[PDB]
Ligand binder design. Structure first.
Ligand SMILES: [Ca+2]
Length: 632
């Protein structure tokens, strides 16, 4: 009947369609459909800017279309080779004053990435974007899987926000956020029975701020919100500023009738490029990590010797030395520790606080990463020692000032051949491709919380069944998983109690992806953990060539297969309270004999063999809080 769209752009197979409404509309907007079903209703576009307003009553003066068809290679993500095929719509907009603004849509089969461009105009060479009107409006029956943005300057030593909040599964849209500050990316929506939508953003660097979703308004609308003024302890302004001609980051919409495109999406990397070339061949792998289970009491020379030895015995590439080391071990003895590790075929990652001036962190070393002079001095020392990586913690929030800090740290690091892990940090936004030496981020309730609180032990399976669909699907997640201890303290006889099985934990090494994995193993595990588990952990990969979603539902259960070289790893876990019965079609395992890790009826780990017939017909039952792993 009566159609108002100015122009329509489709994905290559034409299932995904995006329509644009600008002409004669008070508020410029777009809408999204998949297989003819409305996935996003009319959602606002535009922005408010210190050279002009692009919020209301725009004209679409013209448009252009192009076909993108390229191949790119990317390490440190869920797949190693991407054939990117999309259709690009460029819209040229004008406000009543005649000021100009571009909007670009790139639509692949199951993803939309869009951004604004601002040309040099009005004698202006720079701009401050006061606000984005950019929005996402959903069908009435839509439910949500969101974690809230916290207040600023709360939590441990006033270090929040730190992207460390809890989810609600299938929540009503009308629900109010826990703190009244909306939700951090990425954000998962179930469109009734018509499939799924994941909202995020990518290509955020020093030229913008990190963004998030507001609370709902009008019953169904989420608006792109800029960081809160109280972040970074009130230092630095909220509104992002950049040179003209310039652009906003990419807003991303992963949409499908199934969970498969959600899990397998590469849109955080589809629309960004490396910001520098590296001369270093960065080696990824596995680390031992004393602090997770042995905590602050482990930060001393002899215990670090113990974990270095443990890494050597495990054949692990790295050992992570955590907070307090500069004061309880010292820079001087660190050299002999590094030498000792090298003689054992082990290299080190060292913990640093990013923090200089915005919080109350005392754990050191502090003030070695915020000042470029001091930072480069430090990194020269690190490189001269042959330290291979750093873990940088406790950042100041989402303000562009903090983005500047992230990027500059990464750049100096690369100049000194150092890999970088971020903790106490924001969500990575396509950062693996943008930064050659980036090797992962926290931005999640990590395994440390299970050590801290029994609640997070009880919730482990639920969150594990969330991450492949949400947090981890858009980027590396340094979770610190695989706890083979039964009791989460040093002597394995106190503290919190793991609620999941060993095979669950093993499966979690495949489910949760990060290039440099610092697992929560401990030396005592070589004595008090069944040999098959430790044997597996000796062969665990941390990098992948391909990832295939097999089955699952967010927060309930998850089944995925990941390939390294010619070897396929299928991992599944169950967060339900009733046993889970799977009939799977596994092309992977053809007519082959696979190695099967399973919970025995008593819940203990068992390794057997399983013949998968030419039909690919596998059948399996998974106990609650349990898992299954197939390798061939
Ligand atoms: Ca943390």
């Amino acid at each position: 009947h009566m159609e108002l769209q100015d122009v329509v752009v489709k994905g290559p197979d034409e299932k995904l369609q995006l329509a644009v409404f600008v002409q004669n509309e008070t508020k410029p907007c777009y809408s999204v459909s998949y297989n003819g079903k409305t996935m996003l209703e009319k959602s606002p576009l535009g922005m408010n800017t210190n050279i002009g307003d692009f919020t209301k009553n725009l004209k679409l003066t013209g448009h252009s279309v192009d076909k993108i068809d390229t191949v790119y290679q990317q390490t440190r993500i869920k797949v190693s080779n991407v054939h990117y095929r999309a259709n690009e719509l460029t819209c040229h907009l004008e406000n009543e004053q005649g000021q100009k603004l571009g909007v670009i849509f790139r639509v692949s089969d199951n993803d939309v990435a869009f951004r604004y461009t601002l040309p040099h105009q009005g004698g202006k060479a720079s701009v401050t974007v006061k606000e984005e009107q950019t929005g996402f409006r959903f069908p009435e029956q839509t439910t949500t899987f969101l974690c809230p943005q916290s207040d600023a300057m709360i939590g441990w030593k006033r270090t929040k926000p730190s992207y460390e909040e809890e989810y609600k599964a299938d929540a009503p849209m009308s629900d109010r956020s826990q703190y009244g500050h909306g939700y951090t990316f990425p954000c998962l929506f179930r469109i009734g029975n018509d499939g799924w939508v994941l909202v995020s953003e990518t290509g955020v660097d020093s030229r913008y701020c990190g963004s998030r979703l507001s609370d709902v308004s009008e019953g169904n609308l989420y608006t792109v919100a800029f960081p809160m003024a109280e972040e970074n302890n009130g230092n630095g302004t909220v509104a992002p500023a950049f040179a003209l001609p310039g652009a906003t980051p990419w807003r991303t919409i992963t949409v499908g009738d199934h969970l498969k495109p959600i899990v397998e999406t590469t849109v955080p990397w589809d629309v960004v490029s490396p910001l520098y070339e590296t001369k270093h061949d960065y080696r990824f792998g596995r680390g031992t990590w004393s602090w997770i289970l042995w905590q602050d009491g482990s930060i001393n020379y002899d215990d670090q010797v113990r974990y270095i030895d443990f890494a050597s015995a495990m054949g692990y590439e790295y050992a992570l030395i955590d907070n307090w080391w500069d004061t309880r071990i010292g820079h001087q003895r660190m050299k002999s520790l590094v030498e000792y590790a090298r003689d054992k075929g082990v290299e080190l990652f060292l913990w640093y606080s990013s923090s200089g001036y915005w919080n109350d962190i005392e754990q050191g070393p502090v003030n070695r990463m915020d000042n470029a002079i001091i930072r480069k001095r430090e990194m020269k020392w690190l490189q001269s020692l042959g330290v291979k990586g750093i873990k940088v913690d406790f950042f100041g929030g989402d303000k562009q000032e903090t983005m500047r800090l992230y990027e500059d740290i990464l750049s100096d690091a690369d100049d000194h051949g150092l890999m970088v892990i971020f903790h106490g940090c924001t969500l990575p936004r396509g950062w693996e491709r943008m930064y050659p030496n980036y090797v992962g981020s926290e931005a999640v309730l990590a395994s440390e919380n299970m050590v801290f609180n029994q609640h997070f032990c009880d919730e482990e399976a639920f969150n594990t069944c969330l991450h492949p669909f949400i947090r981890n699907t858009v980027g590396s997640m340094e979770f610190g998983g695989c706890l083979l201890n039964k009791r989460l303290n040093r002597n394995n006889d106190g503290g919190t109690t793991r609620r999941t099985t060993d095979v669950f934990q093993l499966a979690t090494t495949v489910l949760l992806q990060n290039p440099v994995q610092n697992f929560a193993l401990a030396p005592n595990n070589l004595k008090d953990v069944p040999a098959v588990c430790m044997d597996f952990m000796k062969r665990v990969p941390t990098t992948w060539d391909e990832t295939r979603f097999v089955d699952g539902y967010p927060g309930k259960y998850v089944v995925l297969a990941r390939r390294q070289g010619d070897t396929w790893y299928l991992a599944a876990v169950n967060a339900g309270k009733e046993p889970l019965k799977l009939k799977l079609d596994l092309e992977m395992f053809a007519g082959k004999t696979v190695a099967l890790y399973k919970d025995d009826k008593k819940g203990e780990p068992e390794l057997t063999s399983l013949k998968v017939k030419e039909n690919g017909k596998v059948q399996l039952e998974i106990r609650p809080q349990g898992g299954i792993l197939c390798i061939k």
